[PDB]
Design an enzyme around this catalytic site. Structure first.
Site: not given
Ligand SMILES: Nc1ncnc2c1ncn2[C@@H]1O[C@H](CSCCNC(=O)NCc2ccccc2)[C@@H](O)[C@H]1O
Ligand SMILES: Nc1ncnc2c1ncn2[C@@H]1O[C@H](CSCCNC(=O)NCc2ccccc2)[C@@H](O)[C@H]1O
Lengths: 315, 315
Positions: A20, A113, A122, A263
């Site tokens: 994205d 994010e 979520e 996305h």
């Molecule tokens: N309570 C919680 N404690 C710990 N982990 C938790 C909890 N709730 C949810 N999660 C994790 O949060 C992520 C959300 S999805 C973003 C992934 N990060 C990402 O792309 N970073 C790189 C990026 C690049 C460019 C722009 C933005 C970001 C998942 O892996 C969950 O498993």
């Protein structure tokens, strides 16, 4: 929840999120164009995934980056940080931000994010706000800092017919009883901007510095300024993301249908009874967003419009 | 399995399957153009879903239709059959075909739509063959009766780069360790037919009348007749479905990339090391398809080609 963190264990969702460009370039630009925010600071990356935000922050001069994820993707993040030779700046910790032990008392910056479909799907902002209340130093900052949700009216009789009327005649057989399962399910899809029939209306403003957890369940009375005489068949929702506090180079992106697709697409609430609107009309309605009582990561959206009320679910 | 029948509880998969015109019209045409197969017969619809095959069979003159599904969709099927006033011909039974009690000893015809990605994904044919062995009368018929699986070579350096090389440089950071999770996952996608570089090779012929359960795990030695000098980047798999036995009007459809797209698309196995082939070359390889030891609804595909071996997984 085991199902929730399991889904984020697979590289597939991380690939989609990283590809994205609007999302990924927005965060990259925010960090690379405001290095004064990161220089010599302690940074907490909440839900670090593959860990590229932590590596952005390191490049921007962070003294120390703590990347936290409960998902199995964190093991991939550990290998990625070692491959990039950043292990002396970036420490990765496996666990929920609510229960892991951090090797510091306070951090200067939280980045995340956390955004779902229709922003709050979520319920991951609850976790970021936990992290802010426990760990953010006096005078610290959380990014992105400002989020809005908007609604806009849609006229698309053909899309409505394809999802609803479809079930009236399936190769000559009646399947009308299926309509009852379809109407209450919010649809995540890219909306043709030619089918918009109102100006957008903001229904929620969040500042992550001042918002409470309790503020994330809300009601709004909205007015949609109708711009096209037509049959209103749906209301669409989307959200805007701002990087503002202490920025010399402010960054914004929209997930709206007039903007490049992300996305997150748009969230569409199909009307059980489409109704006629006229250009110039002020269409009044009420929307309430609650956590699903059964699964608090799922959303309930209660919509009152044209003297009728329907509750919609996001998974 | 609870996860398996849960997924088929939601109307979404049934909508996608019903809107697949190639699939749905093929079954409709098979039944409506061969009514001698159904007239005054006892018909078992194994995994009836919404129940429209049972209603097809009734229209074609079935004396009695038994529709069986373990999914919660069966409750929707019950309402659908009542809405169509067919309850005197069609009886719906909730449960696994392996354990439900049928109000007959034998049936004249078994019909089913059991096919997964790469034909055998989900392993539902095992259930249909259970039903045939237990319930099919002497001189009875099972439809569809004949299935084939084929392989074809692909050259698509750009698609390969987008899935694999992508992870070498992500905004300047190395994420090469992610490639290890990507290569072994078979991709379900619509293949551009301009990227085909071989004639297809059949690797499996199944007749549901004579096949055993044990035959559904198989090996094949294949030869791909290369038609374009190019870099081979993937092997794609697809399947063909035939209605033949006792048909005056035979019906076939293909899920191949030269044919109209279906919801099954094509299954693509990306090569870890793409290699050069020449027009006229006879490319020899070996493919083995097994049930996943951990989850027997998941498939393992072992491919030997160009003196290298990779095992691929479908979910
Ligand atoms: N309570 C919680 N404690 C710990 N982990 C938790 C909890 N709730 C949810 N999660 C994790 O949060 C992520 C959300 S999805 C973003 C992934 N990060 C990402 O792309 N970073 C790189 C990026 C690049 C460019 C722009 C933005 C970001 C998942 O892996 C969950 O498993
Ligand atoms: N052991 C089992 N016992 C009982 N039910 C089982 C078992 N294994 C799987 N299932 C069910 O089998 C279905 C497979 S998906 C096809 C749905 N049927 C359908 O569209 N029919 C209409 C149609 C229209 C046109 C062309 C073809 C078909 C699911 O609902 C599973 O829950």
């Amino acid at each position: 929840d085991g199902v929730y963190f399991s889904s984020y264990g697979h590289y597939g969702i991380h690939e989609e999120m990283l590809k994205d460009k609007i999302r990924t370039e927005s965060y990259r630009d925010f960090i690379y164009q405001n290095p004064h925010i990161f220089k010599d600071k302690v940074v907490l990356d909440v839900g670090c995934g593959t860990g590229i935000l932590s590596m952005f922050a390191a490049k921007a001069g962070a003294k120390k980056v703590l990347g936290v994820d409960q998902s199995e993707i964190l093991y991939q993040a550990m290998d990625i940080i070692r491959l990039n030779k950043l292990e002396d700046t970036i420490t990765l910790i496996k666990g929920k931000i609510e229960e892991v032990h951090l090797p510091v008392e306070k951090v200067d910056v939280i980045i995340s994010e956390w955004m779902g479909y229709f922003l709050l799907f979520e319920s991951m902002l609850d976790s970021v706000l936990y992290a802010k209340n426990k760990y953010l130093a006096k005078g610290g900052s959380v990014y992105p800092d400002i989020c809005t949700i908007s609604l806009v009216a849609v006229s698309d009789v053909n899309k409505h017919a394809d999802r609803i009327a479809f079930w009236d005649d399936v190769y000559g057989f009646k399947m009308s009883c299926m309509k009852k399962a379809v109407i209450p399910e919010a649809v995540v899809e890219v909306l043709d901007p030619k089918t918009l029939i109102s100006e957008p209306c903001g229904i929620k403003h969040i500042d992550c510095h001042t918002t409470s957890i309790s503020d994330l369940e809300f009601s709004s009375d909205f007015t949609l300024k109708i711009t096209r005489t037509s049959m209103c068949t749906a209301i669409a929702g989307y959200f805007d993301i701002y990087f503002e506090k202490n920025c010399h180079n402010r960054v914004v992106f929209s997930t709206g249908p007039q903007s490049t697709k992300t996305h997150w697409k748009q969230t569409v609430f199909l009307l059980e009874k489409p109704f006629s609107v006229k250009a110039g009309e002020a269409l009044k309605g009420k929307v309430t967003v609650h956590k699903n009582k059964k699964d608090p990561r799922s959303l309930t959206v209660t919509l009152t419009l044209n003297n009728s009320t329907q509750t919609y679910g996001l998974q």
